[PDB]
């Protein structure tokens, strides 16, 4: 049998360690920092940056999901990115 000590020792070098029910529950909680900075953005810009930066869709797919030309998706992406860069400055948060 593999011992618990070996499991923990192996987890110390692993990309993701051994998480606990506490860490799970607190990670599932709202940020109350990032969420507030996202709600300050207008709904169109926060939606564009959500489908782009958070989700990872390519730009054309964002132009498809919400019905807008490419120009509004790109422009809303740049302006929403700028505003979110203003609303927070964090090396980590």
């Amino acid at each position: 049998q593999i011992t618990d000590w070996q499991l923990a020792s192996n987890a110390e070098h692993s990309s993701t360690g051994l998480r606990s029910a506490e860490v799970e529950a607190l990670e599932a909680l709202p940020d109350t920092e990032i969420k507030e900075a996202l709600q300050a953005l207008p709904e169109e810009f926060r939606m564009a940056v959500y489908y782009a930066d958070v989700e990872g869709f390519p730009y054309k797919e964002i132009a498809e999901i919400m019905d807008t030309p490419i120009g509004t998706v790109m422009s809303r992406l740049h302006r929403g990115r700028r505003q979110l860069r203003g609303l927070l400055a964090d090396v980590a948060r």
Binding site: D4, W5, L7, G17, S20, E22
Partner: protein, 84 residues
């Protein structure tokens, strides 16, 4: 008596004894866990203090729980507190 001040009514055997400090020490023994790492295999809490582990609730302890007729304590221990 150092507390009241009264003398103890009877003579007490006193002297010098050689006493050793054994290697079972409460600093090593005390352990407590609310929540911690779990095994990737059985998905139960890890064992042992070094692993920040949980306590073993065994077959005989379940016999005790059943003799008490405590159903929700037993279920809670073996589900939401372990591998659920």
């Amino acid at each position: 008596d150092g507390r009241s001040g009264e003398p103890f009514p009877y003579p007490v055997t006193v002297g010098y004894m050689y006493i050793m400090k054994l290697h079972h020490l409460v600093d090593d023994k005390i352990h407590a866990r609310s929540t911690g790492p779990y095994s990737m295999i059985t998905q139960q809490p890890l064992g042992g203090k070094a692993q920040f582990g949980g306590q073993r609730f065994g077959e005989m302890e379940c016999w005790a729980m059943q003799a008490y007729g405590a159903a929700y304590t037993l279920q809670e221990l073996l589900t939401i507190k372990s591998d659920d």
